[PDB]
Paper text:
As the first N-terminal acetyltransferase discovered on an organelle, NatF, encoded by NAA60 and also named as Histone acetyltransferase type B protein 4 (HAT4), Naa60 or N-acetyltransferase 15 (NAT15), is the youngest member of the NAT family. As an N-terminal acetyltransferase, NatF can specifically catalyze acetylation of the N-terminal α-amine of most transmembrane proteins and has substrate preference towards proteins with Met-Lys-, Met-Val-, Met-Ala- and Met-Met-N-termini, thus partially overlapping substrate selectivity with NatC and NatE18. Another important feature of NatF is that this protein is anchored on the Golgi apparatus through its C-terminal membrane-integrating region and takes part in the maintaining of Golgi integrity. The structure of hNaa60 protein contains a central domain exhibiting a classic GCN5-related N-acetyltransferase (GNAT) folding, along with the extended N- and C-terminal regions.
To rule out the possibility that the electron density we define as the alternative conformation of the thiol terminus is residual electron density of the displaced side-chain of Phe 34, we solved the crystal structure of hNaa60(1-199) F34A/CoA. The structure of this mutant is highly similar to hNaa60(1-199)/CoA and there is essentially the same electron density corresponding to the alternative conformation of the thiol. We hypothesize that if Phe 34 only works to facilitate the binding of the hydrophobic N-terminal Met residue, to mutate it from Phe to Ala would not abolish the catalytic activity of this enzyme, while if Phe 34 also plays an essential role to position the ethanethioate moiety of Ac-CoA, the mutation would be expected to abrogate the activity of the enzyme. In order to rule out the possibility that the observed loss of activity may be related to bad folding of the mutant protein, we studied the circular dichroism (CD) spectrum of the protein and determined its crystal structure. Both studies proved that the F34A mutant protein is well-folded. Same alternative conformations of CoA were observed in the hNaa60(1-199)(F34A) crystal structure, and our kinetic data showed that the F34A mutation abolished the activity of the enzyme. Taken together, our data indicated that Phe 34 in hNaa60 may play a role in placing co-enzyme at the right location to facilitate the acetyl-transfer.
Author numbering:
A (entry chain A), B (entry chain A): 5 to 199
Amino acid sequence: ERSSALSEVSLRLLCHDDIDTVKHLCGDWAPIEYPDSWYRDITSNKKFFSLAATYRGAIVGMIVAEIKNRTKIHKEDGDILASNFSVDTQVAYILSLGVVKEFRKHGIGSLLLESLKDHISTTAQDHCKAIYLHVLTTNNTAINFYENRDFKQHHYLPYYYSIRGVLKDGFTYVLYINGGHPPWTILDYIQHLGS
Amino acid sequence: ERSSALSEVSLRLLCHDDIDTVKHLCGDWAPIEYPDSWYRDITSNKKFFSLAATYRGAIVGMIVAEIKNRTKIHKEDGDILASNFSVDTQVAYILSLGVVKEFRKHGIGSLLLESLKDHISTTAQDHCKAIYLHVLTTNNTAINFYENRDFKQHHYLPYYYSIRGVLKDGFTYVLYINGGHPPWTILDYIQHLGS
Ligand SMILES: CC(C)(COP(=O)(O)OP(=O)(O)OC[C@H]1O[C@@H](n2cnc3c(N)ncnc32)[C@H](O)[C@@H]1OP(=O)(O)O)[C@@H](O)C(=O)NCCC(=O)NCCS
Ligand SMILES: CC(C)(COP(=O)(O)OP(=O)(O)OC[C@H]1O[C@@H](n2cnc3c(N)ncnc32)[C@H](O)[C@@H]1OP(=O)(O)O)[C@@H](O)C(=O)NCCC(=O)NCCS
């Protein structure tokens, strides 16, 4: 019944009319409260690649990502790429990837991820050197899914408490593409040169 | 009546019994929701310098700060101190400074700040090289107070949106002490050497 689901799946861009659905879906995935303006931006702004997967015409999954130059990476994650990659270097940040619970394990998430990769390849060619994202420490399912897909856990991000707000702890996961890699230690060089 | 307030002010450490009061006061200053554990930590943990100002025995202001090694600074603020200051270098982060609205402009805030400076001087001597804090962009009163007190606006901190949570925008303000300074550009060196 459901298991036929991929056969009935289509892909389309998110749009403004989807905002209520997106809030509901995002809300199911995590408890965070994004502002209305955020939802408006991801749905409508071309700067983001926002792609929905629909089952029988209804959204059951989405991926939202931004392709950006390396200088746009937040300092917490500044060390994902080695210094020898130029400021012109690009990365893709996955703001959100999610699939409705009933529809998981049907390949929808994989399809969304692959579509992003295809988009990057077309759009940025070899210039984009990494895809990175944040996951909550608690998301076993997500972590397993990314790890199986060659993402590496770059580092732990601690709880953040400030007058500005509060952040839960998390991990940064990175998939390197087109020769991208993290900064190398003396030992890393020693091995490459040494052998 | 109120104007006599400083004459009736005393200073004491925060303690566990203060948690409800602290929540109420902090809540008045800003809308952020810290967890109970945070309040428990600032009130009870010696790692923090948490000092209250009381008027007629009731808390009307507080300062909470942590003296820490430079490696403990978050990456967003990693560039507050120049690289030539050693990893052994210390800084103080002001988690909170606040005074009840009725009691403002009586010198309580200044007193709290000064007490922190005295504490740093006693505790860390010349080893601590900066005091830094975060302010919301909207806090005109706070900004004026710090600026008048020789704090400098180091940089803007943008809104942060992620699965981990949401942060409002802000500024990092820094007061340099004991010869501390930010990283120097080529031009900075050119001037020092040049003239
Ligand atoms: C991570 C996540 C997106 C995975 O999506 P999916 O579940 O749509 O992903 P897929 O179905 O492609 O892959 C999941 C597993 O099902 C397996 N699978 C694929 N097709 C299958 C099928 N037809 N029958 C049985 N299993 C199948 C896949 O092999 C994969 O297993 P593997 O990792 O061992 O290879 C999903 O777990 C999720 O939405 N988690 C929550 C993420 C979140 O919190 N997002 C917040 C954003 S606001
Ligand atoms: C910033 C803040 C702490 C200042 O405290 P105060 O108001 O207790 O500080 P002071 O009274 O020492 O100084 C304020 C002004 O009053 C002046 N003042 C001092 N004594 C005065 C007096 N007796 N009569 C009139 N003015 C006086 C001071 O000169 C100072 O002016 P200046 O900056 O021009 O020198 C207060 O504005 C505040 O609590 N803001 C909110 C901060 C916040 O949001 N914190 C969140 C933490 S969770």
